Amino acid sequence: LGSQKLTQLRDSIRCVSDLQIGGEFSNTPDQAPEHISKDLYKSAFFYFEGTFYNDKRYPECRDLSRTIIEWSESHDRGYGKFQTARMEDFTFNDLCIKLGFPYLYCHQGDCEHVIVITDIRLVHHDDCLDRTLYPLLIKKHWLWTRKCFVCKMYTARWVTNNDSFAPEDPCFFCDVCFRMLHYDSEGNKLGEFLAYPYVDPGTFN
DNA sequence: CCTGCCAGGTAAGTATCTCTGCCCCGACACAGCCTCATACGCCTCACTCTTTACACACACGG
Ligand SMILES: [Zn+2]
Ligand SMILES: [Zn+2]
Numbered sequence: 001l002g003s004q005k006l007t008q009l010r011d012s013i014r015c016v017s018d019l020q021i022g023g024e025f026s027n028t029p030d031q032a033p034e035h036i037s038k039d040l041y042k043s044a045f046f047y048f049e050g051t052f053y054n055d056k057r058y059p060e061c062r063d064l065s066r067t068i069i070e071w072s073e074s075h076d077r078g079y080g081k082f083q084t085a086r087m088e089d090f091t092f093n094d095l096c097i098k099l100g101f102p103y104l105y106c107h108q109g110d111c112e113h114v115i116v117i118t119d120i121r122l123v124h125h126d127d128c129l130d131r132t133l134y135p136l137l138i139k140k141h142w143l144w145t146r147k148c149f150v151c152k153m154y155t156a157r158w159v160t161n162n163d164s165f166a167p168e169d170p171c172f173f174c175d176v177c178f179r180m181l182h183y184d185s186e187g188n189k190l191g192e193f194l195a196y197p198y199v200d201p202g203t204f205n
Numbered sequence: 206c207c208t209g210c211c212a213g214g215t216a217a218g219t220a221t222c223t224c225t226g227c228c229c230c231g232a233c234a235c236a237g238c239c240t241c242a243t244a245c246g247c248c249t250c251a252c253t254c255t256t257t258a259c260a261c262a263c264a265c266g267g
Contacts, residue, residue: 144258 001134002120005091007057010044010107012135014205017111021197029183033197037108046087046115047104048095053087064106145202148174150181159198164191172198 018038025031043061046053052065065084072082097103097117105113128134146156149171156172163171165181173181182190 001131002093003091004135006046006053007055007088009092009135010046010055010087010105012137013105013107013113014137014140015107015111015113016199016201016205017108019199019201019204023196025195025197026193027189029179029187041108043109044105044107047106048115049097049103050081050083052082052084053090054084055088056086057088064109143202146172146198146200148172148177150174150177155200155203156198157200159196161194161196163193166193 018036020037021033021035022037022040023031023034042055042058043064044055045064047065052068054063054065055061056063063084069082069084071077072079099117099119101116103115103117105115107113123129128136148154148156149166149168150173154174154176157175158173158178160166160171160173160178160182161169163169163181178195182193182195184190
């Protein structure tokens, strides 16, 4: 919406980089997920027409745009001049943008999201007209779902590397069999493996 | 212990090239401008058969 106040679009974009509980569980089969990446690294920014808009809300945030400026001032590699804003006071229709032209949304540091604007049209009925649900993700890709590699009847809850039983190196196991190729009879490691929690983005967001 | 003329056979002759040193050279670098010509390279696009996933359907059989 043209008054939706960015940091509202930001808080609503359903990516899976706002998931993926970190940490390696190689000796902890049953571990409480302490913090999803959404909670930990709340910093993010929108790049729009030279200017940056940094999510300065949530003072556990930081300035991800800063880094870029650091090498646009020294050793100019294209891109000339740059600017930065706060993204919190700024709402939509406060910008000076092009349509159909790629712009950036970087959240969680390295996930990059292109923010092409398809078209600006005035409000008209035959739509919701609501405000609560208004960001309104109306299309999504229906991605593929990574299933377990031992059995094919469940999804990939666990990703293991350097395993001692996995044919492939990054091997995706459902929780059932993951508990059965490792962690035997007391929940103690078998062989060697680095097991990380997998979110299976075909399922989420 | 040598020495030689004649017949027969043969034969002419005419008629109808591969190195090898060696002086007197072209083409290398490389300088700016400059215009158009040629080559390379790299990522974005296409597509195409062949699976790949996934909601749904439909007998099937006793
Ligand atoms: Zn993301
Ligand atoms: Zn399994």
